[PDB]
C-alpha cells in the first residue's frame, strides 16, 4: 500500500540541471513531511534535503553541501515531491532516495526517524 | 500482537481494532466439600491444642449461623 | 456512558439454585458417598443437572484419627501442634472471608480454592480444550469472574458452591471505541457548542450481531484478549460499526450528546491520546528525553504513543500507554462546523444524529414561520377616521378625497 | 436510578464525636479503671453520654507477667504469636484503610464479642434477636474508627447500627423500558418508570431507597439504610396500580432508544424485546418454552430456569412464591409520537402531559392568529400617489380617470 | 455530578512502561548486580530513566545457606522450622494478593511494602524536604494512592513495581463546595419549580487556575489537608469562585440544574448542615441535651454545628460533623423566586445561568410577539369582495366608487 | 414465609411484595480496648531467644505504626 | 485547623474554606526485588515429624513461585 517511487535520474553533464520527482501513494501526502537522502558510490549515506508539511509552513531545510544549489518542492495536488538539482558537480553522482519523515507523534514538527 | 488504532477527526473519536474476544456467556456450578469431625490434665502443649480446637469449633459454629440465612438477591 | 440502557440481572442465581438443591434430604449424602473414595467426582443431583464435586480439606480424618487417641491426657511432641495449626488455618481463613462478605465472596480467594484445585476443576469441566486452555492460562481472570456461595454444613461435612464462568464466545474480533467532546473554537465565552459521541466502549462480533459494553471499566483485558461479561452488554446490529466510518449513514442512527460546556480534557487510548483543548487551557504532548514536542491548538486532536510518553492538559498529566501498534490519522472536517449554533439543542443526553437534526427541523419551523409573524405587525392597516366622507390610503395615512 | 435526588451525609460523624471525646485527659483512665476488674463495662463519659466498653486482648497481663521474668521451653514462643497475631492484623487492616474500616472484620471484633455487645445493648429483645441472627449483615453496616493509643492502652470505637424500624411491610419495584413496536428504526418512542428500588412503610409515610444495591436481603428481611433514603407520602404506592392517578405524579423517563433488555425480578423476569432481537424463555429440561414478541412482557420463575435476550443469558431466581400477571394496555400507546418529549430524565407523568399541552398550544394558537391574519388588507405602496382597494391589491387611484 | 465532564486516563501506564522495560534482556542482571552489596540502590535502565531499587526479602541466602545443608536428612532444631515459616509467610501473602487482584493491587499492602521500607523509599526519593515530610506523616494516604504492579520473576529474582504518588502542588488554599436543591414553597403539588447548583466538589488553587474535583468522594481528607488526584479533575479559571459570591456574575456562567421534583433532603457540610424541607415533610434540628431547637420552615435553610448534634429530615437522621470552626450565615433572596414558573425550563441537566436566561428570553420573545402583536393587530380592516370594482373606505365600511 | 409478586403490563414493571423491614435509623458507639505494655527495649544468642526477640520487634513496630496512624483522626 | 465555612441562602450552597492542598500531579516508579533460590526437589526420603513439616513448607514456597510464574506469563 505505502510506496515511494523516485524518477528522473540518469546521466547529466557537470554544471547543468536535473529534477528528481518522488511519487507518493498509500498515505496522506499533505499531512506528512518528505526528505531526500543520497548515497555516493562506495560512500555512506548523506542527508540532503527536507520539506515539512503544509500545516507547518512548507519549510525547506537543506544541507550545507547542497545549500543554494538544490531546491526542494512539493505539489500536494498530485502527491509528488521534487528535488531540483542546479549547478551539479561531479560529486553529486550518487543514488538518490526519497523518504518520509516520521513526526514524534501522529502530527508534530519534531521527527524521530525516516519511516518509509 | 499486530494491533491497530484509528482516529477520526470528523467525530473526535478513536477505534482500537485487533483484539480477540473472550466473553463470559454462562455459569457453571461446582460443589466444594470439607469433611468435619463430631467433637463434643495440663501439660506444656495441651493448652495450645485446646485453644486450637476451640478455634475449630467456633469456626464450625459460626458457619452454622451463617448458612442459617440462605443467600438471596 | 450508556450504562443506564443495560438490563438488571442476578449474578449468583444459578449457584443459589444449586444451593437450594443441596438443602434437600439425602442430597448431601450422595456427595459424601461419592467422595468417600476419591477427592474429585462428577455427581448428578436430583433434578438431573450434573455438577463437579471436590473435597479439598479432611479435618475428619485428622482430628478423629491423628488427634483423637491422645484426647487424663498428655501431648508428647510439639510438631503435632504446628501440624494442627497448618491444617486448621484454611478453615479459619474461609470462615473469615465468609463472615465478612455475608456468605458470598468475589473474587474467589486462594483459601477458597487454590490454583491446583482450580486447574483440576477446569481440567474436568465439560467444555472444549480451547476453553480449558483459556481458563488455565488466565486463572486470575477466572477468579475475578467467579463467586463463592456458601451453602450448607450438614452431617459432619462442609459445603460451598463455586460459580465458575463459561466462555461461549472466543476469538472473535473486538474493538474499543474512545470518544471526546468536539466543540467549536470561538473566542467569546459560552458561545461555543459541543457534541460528543456516546457509543464509546467495547464492541465484539457475536452471532451475526455486535455485543456492546458501555462501561469499559468492567471489561478485563489481558494481552490482546478481552474478557467481558454479556450481563453488562447490549445486542446491537452490525451496522453500528458504520458510525465509525460515516456518522451520517442512513442505516444506523448514531448516538451523540450535545451541550455548551467547552471544558478541556483528554482520553488516553490504547495506542495514543485524544486531546480536546478548549478555551485558554494549555495542552501539550511531551517526550521523556527532549520534552514538549507538541502544543495543541484549540480543538480536538490526536497524538500517537510512537515517541510520546506524556500528554498534559491543564494541570492534569497523563501517561500514555506504551503498547506497540500502528496508529492511523483519518482527516476530516469536525462535524460541529456543519451546524448552526442558533438552533443547536444544547440540552441533549440520550440523543442521536437524526434526533438532533429533527429537533433542528422544528426550530427552523418555529423561527422561519411563526416568529416571522412580526413582519405582519406594521405591514397592515388601521381603521380610517369614522367621519363624514371617504378616505383613500396614500403614503402611510388616510388622506381623504381632495386628490379627486 | 433516582439516587441523585438523595442527600449527602457523614457516616461516622457520630463515632468520631465519641472519638474526639477520648482524646481528653483522664477520659482514657476512666475506661482503664472501669475495665480493671471485668472485661466489659458501661462508662458514662464527661459529656454524659453512656457507652459500652470492652477489652478484647490484654498483652499487658501477658508480656509483663508471663513473658517479662524470662527476659529479666518452645511452647511459650507459639503462645506469644497466637496472642500477638490479632494486634498485627488489626494494625494491618487499619494501616490500609486509613483508620476507618467497614465491614467490621473478625480480627477487629469476633462473633462472641459482637454477640456480647448486642446482648448488653440498651434496646428491645426483638432487636437483640434480629442483630444476633444476622451478625454478618450487622458487620456490613458497622464501622471501626481507630481512636487513640494512650498510656497504656489501644482504643478504637466500633460504630454499630440501631434498627428503630422493624417488621413493617416492604416491597421492591423493578422497571424496564416500555417502547412502541413500529417497523422503522428511528420511529419508536420509549418510556420507563424511574422509581425502581426498595420501599418500606415507616411512621405513616414510605422510605424509598433508589439504590437497591445498598439494601441487603436475608430471607424475607430487608436491611436498608435511611441515610440514603427518601421520605415519601403513602400515596406513592398508587403508581403501581394506577400510574395516571392525580394524587401522586409518578416519575418516568422518556427516550427514543428502543434497545432490548431484561430485568430479573424476585420471582420472575421482565423482557423488553424490541427490534430484530430474538428473546426467549427456556426450561432446563424442555428447552425453549417461549419466544417473546416485540414489546415488554413478563415470565414467572414457576417452571422457567433461563431467559435469553439477544446474546445475553440470564438465570432467573428460583425462589418460591406466587407471581401474578396484571393485564393492561402499554401506556406508551396512549401518546402521539409526533409531540412526545423524548429528552426527559427527571420527568413525571404531568410534566410530559404539560409539555404536550404546551407543544400543542403553540400550534393551535399560531394557527388561531396566523390563520387567518391574512384576512386583513396590508399597507398600500408608500410612494407619492394614493392607492385605492381593488380585489386583493392596491390599485393606483389615478386610473379614475 | 459533573463527573462526566472528566477525561479518561490510564493509571498504571507509567509503572507498566517501566515493567515492560524490565522484560528486556540483561536489565534483570543489571538490577541483580547493583544490589549484590546493599539492599537498596539507584539504577538507570537502558532508556536512561533512573529508578530506585529495593531488595526487601532474601530467601536465596536463607534456603541455600541456613536451610540447604541440613537437607540421610534429619532436622535437629524445631525453632528453624518456625524461622523458615516466618521468612516464607510474606512471599505467600504477596502471592495471594497478586493472584486475586490479577497482578495489580491498590492500596499497597504492608506485605507488599512495610512501613520502614516505604519511609526508606520516601526518604531516598529525589524531591523536596517538604514532600518527604508530607509523605512521611501520611503513609496511610500514600498507600491509598499507590499501586503495585507485578512485573517478572526471571533469573532467581522476583520483581514488582511500586507506583508511588508525587505531590507537586502542596499547601495551596482549597475549599469544598456543597449544594442542595433550592425550590419554591407553594402549597399546590406540581406547582413548585426547583434549581440546584452542580458545581459541588473540591476546588484548589493551582498554577494560576483552579483544579476542580466533581467527585468529592474520591478526595481524602486528613486534618485540614486534602489529598486529591488530578486524574479526575478539571482545570477551570479562577473566576469560577465568583459563583459563590455572585451567581449572576458576567465573567463566569455558573452551572445549574432545573427540575420540578421538590423532595426534602439534607446535605451535611464540613461545619454544619443544609436542609431543604419541601412539602409536608417535617425537618428538625436537635441537641443531645436540650432536644429539638429548630423546626425548619419550608425552603432551604442552614444550621451550624456549634451546639447542634443531629438533624432529621423526614424519617432520615443525620449526624452533623463536630469539627471546630466558625460558620457564617449569609442571608439573601432565594434566586428561584426571581423566575416565572410559566417560562421556567424544568427539564435541564448540564445547564448554566445564562443558558436558562437564553431560553427564558426566547419564550418571552414568542409571548411578547404573539399577544402584543395579535391584539394591536386584531382590529385591522377586511377587504371588499373582489368584483372588479374599486372600493373606498367610509364610516368603517367599503363603499363603491360613487362619483360623477 | 409467603412472598408474592405482580407484573403490570401497562407500565412494564413488577412489584415484589411480602418482605419485612429492618431499617438502620440511628447509630450506637462502643469502645474496644487493647491494653499494651510499656516495654522500652529487648534487653538481653541461642535459637529460641531469636524468635521471641523478633516477635517483640513485631509488637513494638505494630504499636509504632499505630502511633503514626493515631496522628490523624 | 483555623477552618471557616459560609452558607449562601440565595443559591442554597455552602463553602468550606481553610484547607491545604496535597494534589497528586505525577507518579514515581520503583522496582522491588525478592531474591529466590533454585531448588530442584527435596532430595530426602525421610518420614520423621520435623522433615514432614519442613518439606510441606518448601512445597508452599515452590507452589507460590509457580503461581507467580503463571501470573507473569500487564494492564487493567
Ligand atoms: C394547569 C392548566 O391550566 N392546565 C390546562 C387546563 O386548564 C386546560 O383545560 C387544558 C386545555 O383544555 O390545558 C391545560
Ligand atoms: C425536515 O427538513 C427537510 C429538509 O430540510 C424537509 O424536506 C422536510 O419536509 C422537513 N420535515 C420533515 C418532517 O421531514
Author numbering:
A (entry chain M): 1 to 116
B (entry chain A): 26 to 65, 71 to 103
C (entry chain B), E (entry chain D): 137 to 207, 211 to 543
D (entry chain F): 137 to 208, 216 to 544
F (entry chain E): 26 to 69, 72 to 100
G (entry chain C): 26 to 98, 101 to 103
What does the paper say about this structure?
The RSV fusion (F) glycoprotein is the current leading target for the majority of vaccines and immunotherapies under development. Here, we describe the preclinical characteristics of RB1, a fully human IgG1 monoclonal antibody targeting a region of antigenic site IV of the RSV fusion protein.
The crystal structure of the RB1 fragment antigen-binding (Fab) region bound to the RSV F glycoprotein was obtained to visualize the antigen-antibody interaction at atomic resolution and further characterize the amino acids that make up the binding epitope. Crystal structure analysis revealed that three copies of RB1 were bound to the trimer of the stabilized pre-fusion RSV F glycoprotein (DS-Cav1). From the heavy chain, serine 28 and aspartic acid 30 of the CDR1 loop, tyrosine 56 of the CDR2 loop, and glycine 105 and 106 asparagine 107, serine 108, and tyrosine 110 of the CDR3 loop comprise the paratope. Of the 1006 Å2 interface made between the antibody and the antigen, 191 Å2 is made to the neighboring monomer, which is no longer available in the post-fusion form.
